[PDB]
Structure 1
Amino acid sequence: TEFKAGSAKKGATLFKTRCLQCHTVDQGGANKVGPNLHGIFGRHSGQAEGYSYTDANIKKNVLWDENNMSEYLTNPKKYIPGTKMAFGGLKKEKDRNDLITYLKKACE
């Protein structure tokens, strides 16, 4: 990969403080500003049921794995030019590892 597991506890709080404003991760969780992420891993971009993605996202056709996810989390708009997610990015790889460990775990 390029990714190393971290703290899921740590990732849970990153999520609550940086992602929850626009996303849910729970099965049967609702779309909000952003789409619900439950089952995102191993899925391609733009396929959450009932959500209005931008063309950019859809077209990017990213297969979502832990590695991809890390790259995206660094600077989303640079990864998907045109995306409407208004999140500047997580620069430290340690923060990303934690968050993805948590997402890995909660989105399943």
Structure 2
Amino acid sequence: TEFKAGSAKKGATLFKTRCLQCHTVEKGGPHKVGPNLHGIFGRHSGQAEGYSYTDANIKKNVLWDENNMSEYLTNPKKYIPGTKMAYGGLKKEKDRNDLITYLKKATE
């Protein structure tokens, strides 16, 4: 417990504004710059099929739960150096909380 639920409403707009450029969340949604994130929670990193991940992601072999996801979202490259995800990150815990609350929900 180092993650606490935030707004899904608010989570959804941080997603549209900071993640939608490269990712989809819907089941049957396509890979774009980044992979479709449907069902990511509980999945290891680099396993969406038909997506060309970097050696770094695959290797990090991250098991995604709201907690892992929060550290990563703080600073992706610092978390999986070599990842091709080009997003600086979400420095505020409160934002991370709202977005994860949104993802926890829309990736199911």
User: Aligned pairs, how many?
Assistant: 108
Q: Deviations over 1:60-95 (max 9, x none)?
A: 000000000000000000000000000000000000
TM-score by length of 2: 0.99
Percent identity (aligned): 94
What is the alpha-carbon distance in structure 1 between the residues aligned to residue 37 and residue 5 of structure 2? 19
What is the alpha-carbon distance in structure 1 between the residues aligned to residue 73 and residue 30 of structure 2? 21
What is the alpha-carbon distance in structure 2 between the residues aligned to residue 64 and residue 77 of structure 1? 16
Segments of structure 2 that go 5 or more residues without pairing to the other structure are none
Query: Following TM superposition, by how much is the alpha carbon of 1:33 offset from its aligned partner in structure 2, in angstroms?
Result: 0.1
Query: Following TM superposition, by how much is the alpha carbon of 1:21 offset from its aligned partner in structure 2, in angstroms?
Result: 0.1
**Counterpart residue number, 1:15:** 15
What is the alpha-carbon distance in structure 1 between the residues aligned to residue 68 and residue 57 of structure 2? 14
User: Over the residues paired in the alignment, what is the CA RMSD in angstroms?
Assistant: 0.3
What is the alpha-carbon distance in structure 2 between the residues aligned to residue 39 and residue 24 of structure 1? 11
What is the alpha-carbon distance in structure 2 between the residues aligned to residue 104 and residue 64 of structure 1? 11
